[PDB]
Design a protein around this ligand. Sequence first.
Ligand SMILES: Nc1ncnc2c1ncn2[C@@H]1O[C@H](COP(=O)(O)OP(=O)(O)O)[C@@H](O)[C@H]1O
Ligand SMILES: Nc1ncnc2c1ncn2[C@@H]1O[C@H](COP(=O)(O)OP(=O)(O)O)[C@@H](O)[C@H]1O
Ligand SMILES: CCCCCCCNC(=O)CCNC(=O)[C@H](O)C(C)(C)CO
Ligand SMILES: CCCCCCCNC(=O)CCNC(=O)[C@H](O)C(C)(C)CO
Lengths: 351, 351
Amino acid sequence: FPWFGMDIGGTLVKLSYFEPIDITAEEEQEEVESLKSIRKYLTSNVAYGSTGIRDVHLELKDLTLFGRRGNLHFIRFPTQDLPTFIQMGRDTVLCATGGGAYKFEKDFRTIGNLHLHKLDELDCLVKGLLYIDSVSFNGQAECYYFANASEPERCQKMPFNLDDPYPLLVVNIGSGVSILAVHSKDNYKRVTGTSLGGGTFLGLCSLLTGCESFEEALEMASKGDSTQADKLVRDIYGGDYERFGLPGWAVASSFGNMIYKEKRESVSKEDLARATLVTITNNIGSVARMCAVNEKINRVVFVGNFLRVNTLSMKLLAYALDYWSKGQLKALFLEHEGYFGAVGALLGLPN
Amino acid sequence: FPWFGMDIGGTLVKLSYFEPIDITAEEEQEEVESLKSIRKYLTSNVAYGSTGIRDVHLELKDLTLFGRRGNLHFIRFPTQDLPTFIQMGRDTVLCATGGGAYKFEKDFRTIGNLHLHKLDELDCLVKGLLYIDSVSFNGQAECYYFANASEPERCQKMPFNLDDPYPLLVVNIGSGVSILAVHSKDNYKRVTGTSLGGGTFLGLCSLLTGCESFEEALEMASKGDSTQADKLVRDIYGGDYERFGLPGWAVASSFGNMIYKEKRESVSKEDLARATLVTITNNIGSVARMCAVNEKINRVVFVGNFLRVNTLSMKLLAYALDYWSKGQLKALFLEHEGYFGAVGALLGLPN
Ligand SMILES: Nc1ncnc2c1ncn2[C@@H]1O[C@H](COP(=O)(O)OP(=O)(O)O)[C@@H](O)[C@H]1O
Ligand SMILES: Nc1ncnc2c1ncn2[C@@H]1O[C@H](COP(=O)(O)OP(=O)(O)O)[C@@H](O)[C@H]1O
Ligand SMILES: CCCCCCCNC(=O)CCNC(=O)[C@H](O)C(C)(C)CO
Ligand SMILES: CCCCCCCNC(=O)CCNC(=O)[C@H](O)C(C)(C)CO
């Protein structure tokens, strides 16, 4: 059977698949036509059905896993569309994590000779993260930060070495947000979380702007000025609030200028998309910053698909952590985005 | 001259005025007609112009302040409308706090023989709070909580004694939010804050629903079901996420069901108003809860006008703190709402 790890989240299904590349002659016969057709379907297409996507650029090549050489592939689709995945399967051991491993268990069981092995969402995240960092992204670093994050003509994505990571704060920004303090490979706690996550960003954006996808929401946002919606400290003070170090440019009240009819009539969709992005991102950064200080952790890794192709949010997080802590905290990011749970699930297979 | 403390905030001006009631005969002559007309205007009307409001129900009677007996009055109006206040004045020592004490300083100076004494916003909050609690609300407690907050047929506003308050966490929810750890009368720090405050509630509500006032936003909210907009843990898991104690009913992603077109078409304005309220309130409660635990403080007092006539938010805060901490934390509230800074300013007069 084929090697999968599946993370069925509240918005997206993440699927990691190990394509073997060391198949001997005696192994190519012994392979059944059903297995050969799944292998070929997966590796010959980068789009599956109407909403499945293979992220070719993330592929890990010539990896050795469980004694075998192969390539590790990364595939996502909407959770919504999982019934089509299951139909395909029925028309193997599946290591499955995320909420949908439980919610859709009965649906997986419609695949006749399928054994579902449920694994914990945050266990898999941490195992996946550490594993991907340990193998590298084809020789390049999996982890990166933004050098000189507080100077935005100078700010640059640069590699960061995670070889002795502990203690690490891990902020997983998906539909919602879990924040973990990882003290060793086997010891971590969920310190806190927030329901104001990626789902809140797109949920509010769609309602405010009429955008119909994540990508369109980011595009509107890129053209927007969040200070049109937001009431700033200088709007209240006429400058800095010196005593408590709040510069005039800091947001006093997110969307707070939208209490005035005149302002609501002059604000653009793009402005509201950007304010939504800024509000959700800064809130998360503010909570992470607080957990870091309280846990005595100076490196904070943000992951999950809220940040996928989202440089606005990543740089804002890097800036916010660096500025407000005067360099004591560093925001870190990982090239494999939101796929760690799926990898972690896959790593559970020999058990 | 008349005794005022004024807190000019990002949304509302709060004005505390001390009406003397022990005026001798030799003092009633010596009083100039201008002073007599301001006194009479203030005390004979409960509405001033089109947007000024006197909160009669909050009046403290027969208070002794600075050697004099009087009644302490509480008055608010939109900051927006401050030019009309100033016109009245010019058409005295003013102790002024909040951001607008700085922003509008030049405007105050148009009142010919006015001395403006600027005081710090959070200094005045703490001084005012402690003072109002120490004098009582006409024999009744200024501070209260919700007894049995986690059982909502049993939940009841009950008086709470603040006679030895320290340490206390103070959450000031106005346009934005400041969170203070108060360790004695003179020693406190601003531990953190959030820009997702009262202004965010009404700002987003107005944009989402077409409501044109705070009160209308609460009224829509009262009729709404926030679980229509919000994606719950049970929507992801099909039940509880047991391992990390997240019951199926907890919000996984605020507004997270609004990523689906079908859902956006079936959701009501009332549902969105309630989801806005729930999202803003729980986020604040979640941050306060975290600061309390980290500061080793078990009483959290929430104040500010976000909570004015807002039992939905107060009970949700009381429930959230009690439930998620298993009784270790108590949410507290204060009868004088958002007026503490204005009182604190007034208390600065003899300096
Ligand atoms: N193609 C996409 N479709 C839907 N959401 C996306 C997409 N790309 C990025 N996102 C963002 O990613 C978030 C989901 O992240 P993910 O880590 O997969 O979490 P979950 O396990 O909750 O699905 C969404 O809330 C959204 O903000
Ligand atoms: N009559 C009102 N007009 C405007 N906002 C109100 C009113 N009543 C309650 N509010 C709420 O009170 C908040 C302002 O609280 P306040 O403590 O006066 O803060 P600030 O000093 O920022 O003005 C608003 O953001 C709103 O949520
Ligand atoms: C004092 C108020 C305290 C309120 C505490 C409840 C806040 N809510 C949360 O932490 C859930 C956030 N969401 C998540 O972690 C994730 O979406 C998962 C559900 C794990 C699925 O990926
Ligand atoms: C790592 C990200 C850290 C981000 C830190 C900035 C967050 N913003 C704030 O705390 C301001 C909230 N607002 C207020 O406190 C009040 O409205 C006042 C401006 C005092 C006027 O009453």
